[PDB]
Write a protein that binds this ligand. Structure first.
Ligand SMILES: *Cc1c(COP(=O)(O)O)cnc(C)c1O
Ligand SMILES: *Cc1c(COP(=O)(O)O)cnc(C)c1O
Ligand SMILES: [Mn+2]
Ligand SMILES: [Mn+2]
Lengths: 312, 322
């Protein structure tokens, strides 16, 4: 047993497969050619709300005076979405350095926005400060086990969509998605590698694997990947420890290079957090992954990006 | 003499000629866009095509047509004039086939397209942004290189290649009711019309065009070719060309209607795809959606429900905006 069950994943599928897009897998010949593998992009940027976070947010909501949470943007959008549908008012704690377009999008989704400082701590606290003030319930971005169940239903889709899939490269923050995916993937096929991808400026998931024990960022990460700044937690760590095959960390310049490659060559408007998976596959350290592993599916997790970035 | 410069047999042959090198691009949908439009829209995603637009189909078909059974008589060089996208596609096509490319590009053509043409290894030669200057400069470069002109939209093999878009859509959307196609020189909408009217003429073919460059509209009203008096100025930089002698007769006979759209309408539809579909189209590719959202398209019968819009390109500067 881990915090969520295989069973909890299918019930989440059936609980959200009525308002959730079975998003496409797109491919790319020029990108297949720079990798030297056969890349398959799971396009979760096309999802309702702009990222995969509608799954866990719907499933948490289905499966209250208010609902409250902390977000850099995505969960705060997919929660406020799934809660507006049930008439429930919503409060969203969002770091002050957090993306301006993910802020404006949360208010336009109806909810009250309250600014915190950028950290797992300031967030996880200015969150319970509103809970006390509103008597609302909390829905947690990656540790709440309904939310973790919502995201494993990415993995079911990928197994059909890519019949002959060799590896799933997944961006990790709190690890809700990559853990939720490993709970699902590793049962049905264990010759399917599960690689985690993560910026070097925020390498708690790599450090934890190196150390063999939960090793969170103790300084707030400075990284262009605004959506993976969160540390992995207690529920999701065990799964990452046992079922994730490796972790690949990437520099700011690798993330920026690979996100620009998806914009320019694939014409997909991903947020830079979604370029981390590809960054990992194009890395010096990935060029030594067994040439047997050919069929790499990369999760493009979101497209909630401000149409005016540092244009860097 | 009843024959147009191409038939459907040319399109099926183009498909064979190129299918091994061009992507069979997806047809994506958006429930929020269907809501705004009040129709079921199907976005044929030619921005995912190689070189970032559909132009690779025609440029590759024409190239392949120029190469004989032995190496003898193969072109020394290929020459064209282009606002950027045909230049790219021809350079890439010529590169696969080991032929040198010389592209004549207007100075005022987008920088990203100029950079792309150079990245693929062409020599770029600059002209004024007019139909006439593009042609005279390209004729100078032909006489100097002993090269062969592959015209952006009047060459039959290019028209035939762009028509393979319609072959795929017909497969991808079984109960398609209409195609909407941006029109500049008309190679693309002529090859589509030919293909759609030959196989399933109950499907509508509609041209979409900026009102700032409405020579297709005005030519259809008059019943004769009537180009733009002045070079057209519009944010839809891919469709400033005028229609020509080879595409005019097909557009005349087989294109059902022409919808013109304002600059603001093009801007708005383009932003709507970027934000709502997360698809990086260039403004010329928002012309078809602008047209479906226009006041005037409101008189398209409610029976014309399943509308396929060709998103023809994704070649836009990322740092450049407004
Ligand atoms: C939340 C998020 C992730 C990572 O999910 P975790 O469960 O936090 O690992 C990756 N990409 C995007 C765009 C996200 O919003
Ligand atoms: C060239 C082009 C068109 C117009 O094609 P024509 O055959 O000249 O009508 C439309 N959209 C894009 C992106 C183009 O590059
Ligand atoms: Mn981390
Ligand atoms: Mn015109």
């Amino acid at each position: 047993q881990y915090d969520i069950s295989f069973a909890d994943v299918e019930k989440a599928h059936l609980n959200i497969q009525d308002s959730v897009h079975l998003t496409p897998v797109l491919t790319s010949s020029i990108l297949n050619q720079i990798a030297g593998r056969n890349l398959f992009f799971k396009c979760e940027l096309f999802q309702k709300t702009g990222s995969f976070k509608i799954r866990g947010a719907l499933n948490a909501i289905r499966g209250p005076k208010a609902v409250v949470t902390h977000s850099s943007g995505n969960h705060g959008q997919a929660l406020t979405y799934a809660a507006k549908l049930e008439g429930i008012p919503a409060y969203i704690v969002v770091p002050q350095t957090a993306p301006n377009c993910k802020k404006l999008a949360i208010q336009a989704y109806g909810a009250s926005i309250v600014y915190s400082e950028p950290s797992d701590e300031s967030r996880e606290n200015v969150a319970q400060r509103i809970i006390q003030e509103t008597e609302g319930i909390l829905v947690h971005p990656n540790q709440e086990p309904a939310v973790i169940a919502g995201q494993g239903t990415i993995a079911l889709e990928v197994l059909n969509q890519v019949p002959l899939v060799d590896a799933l490269v997944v961006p990790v923050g709190g690890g809700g998605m990559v853990a939720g995916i490993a709970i699902t993937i590793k049962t049905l096929k264990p010759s399917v590698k599960v690689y985690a991808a993560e910026p070097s400026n925020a390498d708690d998931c790599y450090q934890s694997k190196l150390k063999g024990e939960l090793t969170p960022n103790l300084h707030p990460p400075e990284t262009i990947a605004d959506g993976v700044k969160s540390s992995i937690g207690l529920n999701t760590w065990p799964i990452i420890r046992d079922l994730v095959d490796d972790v690949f960390t990437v520099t700011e310049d690798e993330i920026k290079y690979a996100t620009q490659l998806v914009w320019e060559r694939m014409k997909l408007l991903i947020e830079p957090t979604a370029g981390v998976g590809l960054a990992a596959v194009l890395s010096q350290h990935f060029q030594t992954v067994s040439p047997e592993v050919k069929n790499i599916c990369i999760v493009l997790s979101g497209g909630n990006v401000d149409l005016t970035s540092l244009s860097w």
